[PDB]
Amino acid sequence: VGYLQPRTFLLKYNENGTITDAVDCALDPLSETKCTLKSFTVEKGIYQTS
Amino acid sequence: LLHAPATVCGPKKSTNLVKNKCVNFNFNGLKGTGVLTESNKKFLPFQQFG
Numbered sequence: 001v002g003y004l005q006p007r008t009f010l011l012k013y014n015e016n017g018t019i020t021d022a023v024d025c026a027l028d029p030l031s032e033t034k035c036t037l038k039s040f041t042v043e044k045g046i047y048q049t050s
Numbered sequence: 051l052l053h054a055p056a057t058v059c060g061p062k063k064s065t066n067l068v069k070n071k072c073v074n075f076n077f078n079g080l081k082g083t084g085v086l087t088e089s090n091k092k093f094l095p096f097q098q099f100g
């Protein structure tokens with residue numbers, strides 16, 4: 001048994017229409033950079049995130 | 051007219067399909083303007099719009 005609270009997930013959709021991956025936007029700061037760039041892969045650099 | 055989404059309604063009248071024409075489509079609460087054509091994109095059975 002688990003709970004649900006209001007938070008943001010970045011979820012991508014396959015070319016067949018199904019969901020293959022999602023990102024918790026508040027788990028660790030790398031995932032927050034993934035959410036602010038709206039991409040699953042980030043490059044090397046500085047990202048002013050939050 | 052109780053404070054709930056109602057479950058008893060009337061049958062909403064329909065229309066035959068038209069291809070390649072600027073029409074005012076209404077697909078279950080989708081008011082707008084566009085043309086209608088066939089598509090090769092495959093859906094999943096629980097989808098209805100895109």
Ligand SMILES: *[C@@H]1O[C@H](CO)[C@@H](O)[C@H](O)[C@H]1NC(C)=O
Pocket residue numbers: 014016
């Ligand atoms: C997408 O659906 C088609 C239809 O059969 C299938 O051939 C293809 O392998 C599917 N691709 C993925 C990534 O699920």
